[PDB]
């Protein structure tokens, strides 16, 4: 049977909609199933072309937890699913970024990324502790790399389990977009990654 998708990625597009994307290591296509974590009716999207690995889901309820499951299908049958639980949080003093009124959350991921540009070549990144880590938190791995590819990544190890964690990142070329990734290291392993791209102006 088809392999399990190797990656499942979520991006909030608004308070009630998100993009779900996945990666597979021929196929008829994929199924994307989602439902409220507690008792909701099951919604299944059949994706007919193996080359389409993303879909937009709309009409989600704000501040409600949803479970998403993605599987591939072939002639030999359905493969195993990759699963993620996601909430889009929004209101019922920070720099008003477009899309700041809503954030994605999952229990084991670091909180939303908050960036402070300290100078043309330096910034500080901060994030809230995962609300429900799998095991106790030992620290965080933070990676920084040029978003347009090419160069190497820089990996910072942030030790400890503070309610809020912070990292100052120096040596950033001016006006260059950088991709940041944050994930918790726990006694059970690595949690989900939170990723975003910034550019210091």
């Amino acid at each position: 049977v088809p392999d399990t998708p190797t990656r499942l990625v979520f991006s909030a597009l608004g308070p009630t909609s998100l993009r779900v994307s996945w990666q597979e290591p021929p196929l008829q296509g994929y199924s994307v199933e989602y439902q409220l974590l507690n008792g909701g009716e099951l919604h299944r999207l059949n994706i007919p072309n193996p080359a389409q690995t993303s879909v937009v889901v709309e009409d989600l309820l704000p501040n409600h937890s949803y479970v998403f499951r993605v599987r591939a299908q072939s002639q030999e049958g359905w493969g195993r699913e990759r699963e993620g639980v996601i909430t889009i949080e929004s209101q019922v003093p920070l720099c008003p970024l477009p899309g700041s009124a809503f954030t994605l959350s999952t229990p084991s991921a670091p909180g939303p990324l908050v960036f402070t540009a300290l100078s043309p070549d330096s910034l500080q990144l901060s994030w809230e502790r995962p609300r429900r880590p799998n095991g106790d938190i030992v620290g965080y791995l933070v990676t920084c790399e040029m978003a347009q590819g090419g160069g190497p990544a820089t990996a910072f190890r942030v030790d400890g389990d503070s309610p809020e964690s912070r990292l100052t990142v120096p040596g950033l070329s001016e006006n260059v977009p950088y991709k940041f990734k944050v994930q918790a290291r726990t006694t059970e392993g690595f949690g989900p990654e939170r990723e975003g791209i910034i550019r210091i102006e």
């Binding site: 990666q23 920070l94 700041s100 540009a117």
Partner: peptide, 24 residues
Amino acid sequence: SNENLLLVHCGPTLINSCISFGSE
């Protein structure tokens, strides 16, 4: 790709970030 512009001296800025399960 989505790039979030940061302004020096605007202070803490919440950006939109993706959550990924698994490995890239």
